[PDB]
Amino acid sequence: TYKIYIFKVLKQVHPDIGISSKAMGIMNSFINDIFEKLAQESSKLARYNKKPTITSREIQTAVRLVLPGELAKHAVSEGTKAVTKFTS
Amino acid sequence: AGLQFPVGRIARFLKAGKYAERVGAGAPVYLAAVLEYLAAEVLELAGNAARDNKKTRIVPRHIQLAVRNDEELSKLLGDVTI
């Protein structure tokens, strides 16, 4: 469940604003739905190779295909920064 | 990686569903940062709607308003009911 991680992010963006049980259920359904869309898409992309392998390249493509264009562009940049910070 | 979202469960979930036989170490980091980005976008807009309506908490109505007024979120997420 992403609810605790959604809560932590809510408190960085709106320190002084809370969230109802029903609203948090909606946020958590959004995140699960996107996860599955990106996972399914990355699964097709990786299906080309034997030993199907999902790397940051498959995720990056999956993001550029599934997300609307301006969301995709910001998400790709976020994805890239996080792998650069992890790597270095 | 800077993130609040969890990198750990992703590789296990992908293997256990046979989404792939192998997962690179960058893939879960990338994916968690993307999910965190989208949560932050929705929350920021939902919270703005709460504040604009003089509320101190986000309720379903605030998320519905946030998604409905945003062309890309409406496309990605679909309709929000109640």
Partner: peptide, 5 residues
């Protein structure tokens, strides 16, 4: 009714 998360 919709209690705080």
């Amino acid at each position: 009714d919709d209690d705080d998360y």
